[PDB]
């Protein structure tokens, strides 16, 4: 429910087992490095109110502008009130934003 803040990137592939996110600029990556290594957790939108918690499994980078890719795995869903619910219930569609987990 708190202020998640500003986002870091948008989704480019979605499935029950894999979520593939992309970041456009490098400033954002160098800003949020310490919270994007393996093991940490991110949040993805899956509808106006709900959210989905995802675990990082792979990171990667390439040159030719830049491309930064992140590959993650789902664990469950969380609402505004606070209700947690387990299971890959509702996939997140493309063009939805990602946020970092306080």
């Amino acid at each position: 429910m708190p202020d998640l803040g500003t986002p870091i990137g948008s989704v480019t592939d979605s499935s029950p087992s894999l979520i593939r996110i992309e970041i456009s600029s490098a400033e954002d990556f160098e800003k949020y490095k310490s919270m994007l290594g393996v093991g940490q957790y991110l949040l993805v939108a899956s509808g106006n109110n709900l959210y989905l918690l995802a675990s990082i499994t792979g990171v990667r980078a390439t040159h030719v502008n830049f491309r930064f890719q992140i590959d993650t795995q789902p664990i469950g869903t969380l609402s505004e009130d606070g209700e947690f619910s387990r299971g890959s219930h509702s996939l997140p569609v493309p063009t939805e934003y990602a946020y970092v987990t306080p």
Binding site: M1, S24, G47, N48, N49, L50, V93, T95, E96
Partner: protein, 387 residues
């Protein structure tokens, strides 16, 4: 001017108990005290004031100092049949005070009380006050509400609905009956009341309902009722408001629209922004400019300022992903002008402070409300956290 709103409340609760137990053809009447401003003063000027007090174990003039002294001034001004509701454990009798007790009252140990009384004109038929006033030792308010809930159930209804859409609605109808400058008759057939309520399906959020004990569920049932609709991304939503009675409209309507468009219609996939329709003779140019000052842009619909074009108001906007840019994020217009209906029908039509509209139908889920403070609706629409 404490206003002892809970007093009017207990009184209306008693009236409700009577209306439930009232026999066929028996219509109990009511009187709205000077708290209601009525030049008509219907009912042969039989308005009745009241007050509530508790936490007194045994009856002592000491425990009932302030209220008596208070009623004294109101009568000093100038048929106001003062009635007092109180609960003392072990005493359930009604009696009229005598003169020596009145003098006991006149013996003022607190000098501030004497300062307030000095405003009282000495020349007053204190005996008429005594024989006009009555003292009542009655049950507790909360337990009264509980018995009243049980009785409202006894009639028979969907047990889940009575909690949040029935009891406050009835209290509100009775209150409107109590304080309405419009011509009215407190005599109301108890048999109609039942079905008349059996029909309506709109919630209310007035000041009176705020203090009822049912608050706490009045909010949450609605919050759960509206969750599944808003959860979606692309839907057609419509609004209709009456700005007459709303409190502090021109100062907070902007905050409403902005807090809405920030969570529901500022993103790519959102491909059908909302609409807001205001009824009456209200101007819109001021609101439009004051919004543009913020960053949002509207879709008035008028190409030429003369009249509305039904087809343009409902068009679909241009969208662009990186970076995001949205031609319009909200619509706005008046009802008396818009003439006709769309090609596709709505999926939600909220009505704030209005009875009926032409778009109404069967397929269109219609939800109605009645409000004074807008900030209460935000809680229903998940915009914010607490009340």
């Amino acid at each position: 001017a404490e206003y002892s709103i809970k007093g009017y409340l207990y009184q209306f609760l008693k009236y409700l108990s009577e209306i439930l137990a009232a026999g066929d053809g028996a219509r109990i009447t009511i009187e709205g005290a000077i708290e209601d401003v009525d030049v008509i003063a219907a009912g042969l000027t039989t308005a009745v004031q009241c007050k509530y007090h508790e936490q007194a174990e045994k009856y002592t003039l000491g425990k009932i100092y302030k209220p008596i002294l208070l009623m004294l001034e109101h009568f000093s001004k100038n048929h106001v049949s003062y009635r007092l509701f109180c609960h003392f454990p072990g005493e359930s009798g009604t009696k009229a005070l005598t003169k020596d007790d009145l003098e006991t009252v006149l013996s003022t140990k607190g000098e501030v009380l004497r300062a307030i009384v000095a405003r009282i004109d000495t020349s007053v038929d204190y005996e008429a006050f005594l024989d006009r006033f009555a003292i009542e030792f009655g049950p507790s308010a909360e337990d009264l509400q509980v018995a009243v809930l049980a009785s409202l159930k006894d009639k028979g209804f969907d047990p889940d609905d009575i909690d949040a859409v029935i009891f406050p609605n009835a209290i509100q109808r009775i209150v409107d009956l109590a304080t309405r400058s419009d011509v009215n008759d407190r005599t109301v057939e108890p048999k109609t009341f039942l079905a008349g309520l059996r029909e309506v399906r709109r919630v209310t959020f007035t000041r009176w309902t705020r203090e009822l004990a049912t608050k706490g569920r009045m909010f949450s049932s609605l919050r759960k009722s509206l969750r599944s609709c808003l959860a979606h991304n692309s839907r057609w939503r419509v609004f209709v408001i009456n700005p007459l009675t709303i409190e502090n409209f021109d100062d907070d309507i902007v905050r409403f629209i902005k807090a809405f468009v920030q969570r529901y219609s500022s993103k790519y996939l959102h491909s059908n922004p909302p609409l807001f329709m205001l009824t009456g003779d209200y101007d819109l140019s001021v609101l439009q400019k004051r919004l543009y000052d913020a960053g949002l842009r509207c879709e008035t619909g008028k190409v030429g300022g003369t009249d509305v074009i039904i087809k343009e108001l409902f068009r679909r906007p241009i969208l662009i992903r990186n970076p995001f840019r949205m031609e319009f994020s909200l619509r706005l217009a008046k009802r008396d002008e818009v003439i006709g209906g769309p090609q596709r029908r709505p999926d939600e039509l909220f009505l704030i402070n209005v009875a009926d509209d032409e778009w109404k139908h069967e397929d269109v889920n219609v939800h109605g409300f009645k409000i004074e403070r807008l900030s209460d609706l935000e809680y229903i629409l998940q915009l914010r956290s607490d009340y």
